Amino acid sequence: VVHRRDFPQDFIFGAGGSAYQCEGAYNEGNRGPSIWDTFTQRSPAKISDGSNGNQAINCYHMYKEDIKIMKQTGLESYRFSISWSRVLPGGRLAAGVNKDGVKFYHDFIDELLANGIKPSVTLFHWDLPQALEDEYGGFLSHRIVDDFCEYAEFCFWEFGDKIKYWTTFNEPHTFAVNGYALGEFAPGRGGKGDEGDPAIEPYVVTHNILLAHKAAVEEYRNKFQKCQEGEIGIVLNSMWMEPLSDVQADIDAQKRALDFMLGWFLEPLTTGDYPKSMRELVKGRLPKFSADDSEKLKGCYDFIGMNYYTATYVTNAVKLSYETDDQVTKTFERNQKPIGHALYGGWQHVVPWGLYKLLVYTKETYHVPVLYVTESGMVEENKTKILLSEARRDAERTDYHQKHLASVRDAIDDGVNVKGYFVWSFFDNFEWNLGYICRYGIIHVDYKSFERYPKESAIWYKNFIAGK
Ligand SMILES: OC[C@@H]1[C@@H](O)[C@H](O)[C@@H](O)[C@@H]1NCc1ccc(Br)cc1
């Protein structure tokens, strides 16, 4: 019971992909390896099916077609990621600027704009140049801040006379947690039999990412914003955290669970310090900001993008690690009753109203002037063994998105300033440590032949975008 007119004139509708998950052509056009190439190549057993982004779904050679398909759907904007390491093979400026890479993105952008579609660029989507990961530890070093700045500056200069939407980081929480606490994503550090320290590193990384982010924002504010008239922000991710009972302890547990996962970032970006509840528990294992760093972090974004997938109940809990540092046991079940229908993984639960509360929480708690839902979507088993006829009748995914948008509208109505919804993902693509065992897209892709055929949800969204 939700339509296009139910939303402001201002609102933007779109979908996204991200460089590693879509481009393929990992070793063409002089691209330099990312930690994710390396991860999947050296540690194939850490990928559900051994697969990798070598070809992914091959956007690098198929962009002209993909942009047709975007426009057949009516996409108002498309979010994509620049492979740091395709424009700068060795990460620093000294290693050179890859002109082939630089042409690709320009070709790609111009194609988008030639088609009425608004380009929207994430600077970092976890595909860090291996050359930097190796030289000084990647985000375990402060050295990452300036190199990131120089990358950032390069991109603004090179591409920005045509970009209005810059995002510095996607899901630093996921990047830092899965990467340095669970050892599950690149570089694979922290979890049992792995390499780092799951008690130390995730804090160091987030700490440097926020300083990277800072560096990039100022670079843009002071140097490009007035010229290119765009907006730079960051994209965070969170589950909604519901109190299991309605005793105190469970309300504190929600406050802590959100502090640790969201506040880990929003707080610095607000008051210039990590959440009280993180200082309490993490103590001297949490880095301090210098006087000057705190100050310059306050309101250091033009917008907050949010990736929501699901909600969980929380409660007080009973080896040191980020993982267990918020002191909260999480569960999908209240009295064996699941919080929402359980999708393929076991993990995504369809909870439309969690996006409502999450969006309200962020406005209310962190006073964010501008919010976008940057990533919303549902998972689907990659069932080999059924005809495409059947696979594309993803009735449920249409329904998933409606209920979601309906919760977004309700957030706008009750005060919250959301300006955009971006389906994830436009295309079925490579899903990190799960590789190709599942699908998120409104556009089916055959992982072998790369052929693209629209699902029903795509045809729904085409109508929905076109209502008023
Ligand atoms: O499906 C996860 C999507 C990826 O495709 C995108 O790269 C990323 O923005 C998004 N992460 C969502 C997510 C993040 C953490 C966990 Br645990 C489960 C899901």
From Swiss-Prot:
Give the superkingdom in one word: Eukaryota
Q: Name one Pfam family in it.
A: Glyco_hydro_1
Signal peptide positions on this chain: none
Which PROSITE patterns has this protein been placed in?
Answer: GLYCOSYL_HYDROL_F1_2
Uses in biotechnology: Ajmaline is an anti-arrhythmic alkaloid commercially used as an efficient drug for the treatment of arrhythmic heart disorder.
GO BP annotations, alphabetical order: alkaloid biosynthetic process; carbohydrate metabolic process
Q: Which InterPro entries match?
A: Glyco_hydro_1, Glyco_hydro_1_N_CS, Glycoside_hydrolase_SF
Note the Gene3D superfamilies from the entry.
Answer: Glycosidases
- Recorded metabolic or biological pathway in which this protein acts: Alkaloid biosynthesis; ajmaline biosynthesis
Q: What is the effect of changing E375 to D/Q?
A: Loss of activity
Stated name of the protein: Strictosidine-O-beta-D-glucosidase
Which residues are involved in binding a beta-D-glucoside? Q21, H125, N170, E171, Y309, E375, W424, E431, W432, Y440
Catalytic site residues? E171, E375
State the reactions this protein catalyses: 3alpha(S)-strictosidine + H2O = strictosidine aglycone + D-glucose
Entry EC no(s): 3.2.1.105
- Provide the gene name from the record: SGR1
